Amino acid sequence: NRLKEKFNTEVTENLMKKFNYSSVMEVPKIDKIVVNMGLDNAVEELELITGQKPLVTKAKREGMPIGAKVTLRGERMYEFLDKLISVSLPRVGVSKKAFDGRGNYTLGVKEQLIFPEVSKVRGMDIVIVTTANTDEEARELLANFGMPF
Amino acid sequence: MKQEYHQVIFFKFLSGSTKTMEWEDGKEYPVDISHPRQKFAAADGRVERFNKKFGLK
Amino acid sequence: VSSTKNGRDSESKRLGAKRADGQFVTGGSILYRQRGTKIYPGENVGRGGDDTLFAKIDGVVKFERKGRDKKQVSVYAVA
Amino acid sequence: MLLPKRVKYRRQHRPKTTGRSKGGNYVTFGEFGLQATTTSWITSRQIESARIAMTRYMKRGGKVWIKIFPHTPYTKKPLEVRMGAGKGAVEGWIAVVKPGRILFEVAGVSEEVAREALRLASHKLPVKTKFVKREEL
Amino acid sequence: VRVNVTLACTECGDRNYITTKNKRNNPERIEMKKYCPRLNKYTLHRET
Amino acid sequence: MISKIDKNKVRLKRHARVRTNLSGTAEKPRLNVYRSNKHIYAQIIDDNKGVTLAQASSKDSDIATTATKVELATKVGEAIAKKAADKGIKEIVFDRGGYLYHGRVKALAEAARESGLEF
RNA sequence: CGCGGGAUGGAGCAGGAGCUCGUCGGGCUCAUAACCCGAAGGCGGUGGUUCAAAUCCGCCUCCCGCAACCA
RNA sequence: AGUUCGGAUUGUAGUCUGCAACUCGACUACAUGAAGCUGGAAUCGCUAGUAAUCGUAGAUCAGCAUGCUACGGUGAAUACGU
RNA sequence: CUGGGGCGGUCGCCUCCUAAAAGGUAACGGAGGCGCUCAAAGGUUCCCUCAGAAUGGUUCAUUCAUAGAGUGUAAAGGCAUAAGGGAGCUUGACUGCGAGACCUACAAGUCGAGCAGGGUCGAAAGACGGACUUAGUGAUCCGGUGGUUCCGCAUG
RNA sequence: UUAUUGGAGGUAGAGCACUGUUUGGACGAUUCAGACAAACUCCGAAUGCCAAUAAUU
RNA sequence: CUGGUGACUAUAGCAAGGAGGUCACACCUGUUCCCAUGCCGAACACAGAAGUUAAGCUCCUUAGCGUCGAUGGUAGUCGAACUUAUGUUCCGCUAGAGUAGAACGUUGCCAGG
């Protein structure tokens, strides 16, 4: 992926310069992206915009299906993030205070039409989880990666 | 992965999607919004709007 | 006048220890009656369907510690 | 009248009244206290009357801690009924008081004023009491 | 709801197995493999 | 952040749960397998005495080479079974070590089975 | 004193919330009533069982039925 | 097709009268684009150049008419009977 | 039965407290439940770990969290060996028994290693004679139904 | 029966680690202090009980 | 000294600071083959070796939370005498709480150095 090459390039060099690291293994990287649409139509829309079959999340009457979700990591996650940065985001900037206090970020999209690939426009949420130990470190890494903060 | 989704080309750049053009790589892929310049000048302001309307310098 | 809505109890089940530590028992002797594993089956001791602990061989009963908060009962051959 | 907002069991065995006070034998919140020297049940009505006497004598200027609470319900049979046919209904709430227990504590007044307020409270109680101060050394 | 069930296989008249089932949950004639002492083998015993 | 898993400790908990009802005695010792990222080691233990009688490894000078991991596990199983046969060992109980009975662990078990251990 | 039953729009009745009258607005009438057309508006409470309570557990505040004796 | 029906409401920029359009004028341009898809109980007008419908003019009047008064164009249906 | 009798309530089984740290232990003492359910909620192999809170997001993610969840059902005793959650295969919710024990006036009730016959799951050791355990039940006589190398009144 | 030794169990007491009850502070529910319980227990005796091999009986 | 695998009531844990990595243990690289995801090569599994001690892991130091824990005294109590007092006395046993203190594991077997 283009973002994968960007991260393997001096992006990590920027993180090391700005946070004074002693090894390249302590440079934070995005662990995964979990897309949750909180239902055949919703499952199909999520699958067609993401790429894989979603997982139906039941309730903890209890036990009924309520939402759907997808986890991405590796080449697919990197391609998804590049597509979200380039093709998808401007159709919908973004909150820079929505941090977990540990280094993971969450963003909610209300209309699914902002994806290149509906009768009732439902809203989904994206969680980008990284190996960053601080909100500051995660935000700096994401901004370097190109998040439209 | 269990056993569509290819590498379509959306400027131009490679990407993966399901909503399915030669490249420098030599292969072809399936191929509005460049998002805003200043676009429009901001509001003049009431004093400037008043002075310009009546020519009062 | 009035009346009471209580006045019920089940038959007592005579649970608890049936043989002593250091006692000799024939195989099959029930060593402990219990609900759940208040005491665990140790060496040469079995656990029945109703949690009864019984000796699998003839020998001497030994009630012993099992970790910090549990205990067990074993049977060791006299020889 | 002090009483628990709820209890698990409303019908309880009456508590054992032999022995000495398990705890609460020292002044810990105030400066002076009233220490029981004999044993009795202490009812919430007795507690309220004693507290009113104390607070009235100090004009609500100092401050009082009631160290005992009536956790225990007790039952009483309806009048003119024979024995049996189940336990009676809750009649009131008591605290078990044994020698040594501090019943009340007061602070914010002089020793003489506290002594008089505690004497007035003591005369409302079914136990003998002694004026005490915080123990040092 | 729950009724008594007797299972007998084709090549026996032993009818030695009784069991229970929920008539609402299992409206069919239940089948199971059970040991048949006459034939010294497992056989397909089916509810009568 | 995102914590890791410590595969070795997850394995250890699984292995303790297996050892709850798996143990080796004098007449039937336990062939315990440990498998790291690059090497596989097998031991023959009499848990009744707490004593190890035979051992083999993919890092042993005689049984170390540059080969497939499955093949190295096969060689280690053969070496351990040969050592057990040199001793008085015919029947054992296989302690998979908390890993799935697949891949390298399966290869070692099968190699010992072929070379002579009865399990 | 013992046993049991009831608390439903504002009123009388049905009962895990509907009929009639009452209110509001409009109409008919010289006007009122009657009549006609629309709108709103409710599980006695106190704690619990329960995914969920008018509904079920116990109690509380009143009313209602039988009985409250052999001396 | 709540739409190329509807133009209420609101924003902006103007024109004219008037000493002066904030309360509180009329009109214009651009934008916006509400309720409304023939209306319950009930109730009104009209017998012929009438009803219906379409425009026009005047008084008052600096400016302000969906009102009033007046004018023509198109132009029906029905009345068995008390 | 009954702190006289009547009226009221109760009558069998399970769990807890009273019950005095083995077991047992009464009252018209204090609290509740049962007269079922499940074709998997049984067996086996493999994998897995919860409630709650905070922090962000129009259920999803992170960290603390030994259980503060769950365990079909009342309570108690147990259970993160998981006995709790999921998945594949399956029917041991087998047949003949059974050394030896618990309980016990009797009749009953309870546990049970092992042996044989045939299976299921598992690579294998092995586990499995229903369910985390303890309620969900009713004698004999009589009658119905199926089987039967048994009897069957001179013989068939 | 006693002596010694081993064991099972949760009472007395105590305690607040669970459930429930309760009194004062402080802080932005947490923490601090202090209390209550047959059906509370992080704890836990004396006894009594079950057994094993010497003295007496 | 490291590693595997056992035994022992956490004196063994947890937390906070440092040192280490050649072989080893790891993080790691990939998804072509066995295998695997109610979705995901995250985990499971297989191939490996660019890289890094950053983490897990090992060694050193902290009594901070947890854990262990006396002696002395107290509560309670078997027995005995007095006694009817919400009791007293004698004798034996002897808590819980709290204090001193202990503790940052010990140790069997096998393999490597």
Ligand SMILES: [K+]
């Ligand atoms: K009586």
Ligand SMILES: [K+]
């Ligand atoms: K008892």
Ligand SMILES: [K+]
């Ligand atoms: K407490």
Ligand SMILES: [Mg+2]
């Ligand atoms: Mg069982």
Ligand SMILES: [Mg+2]
């Ligand atoms: Mg059973």
Ligand SMILES: [Mg+2]
């Ligand atoms: Mg205290």
Ligand SMILES: [Mg+2]
């Ligand atoms: Mg138009």
Ligand SMILES: [Mg+2]
């Ligand atoms: Mg009577």
Ligand SMILES: [Mg+2]
């Ligand atoms: Mg006793």
Ligand SMILES: [Mg+2]
């Ligand atoms: Mg007992």
Ligand SMILES: [Mg+2]
């Ligand atoms: Mg009942």
Ligand SMILES: [Mg+2]
């Ligand atoms: Mg019943």
Ligand SMILES: [Mg+2]
């Ligand atoms: Mg089960």
Ligand SMILES: [Mg+2]
């Ligand atoms: Mg004859």
Ligand SMILES: [Mg+2]
């Ligand atoms: Mg004959």
Ligand SMILES: [Mg+2]
């Ligand atoms: Mg007590």
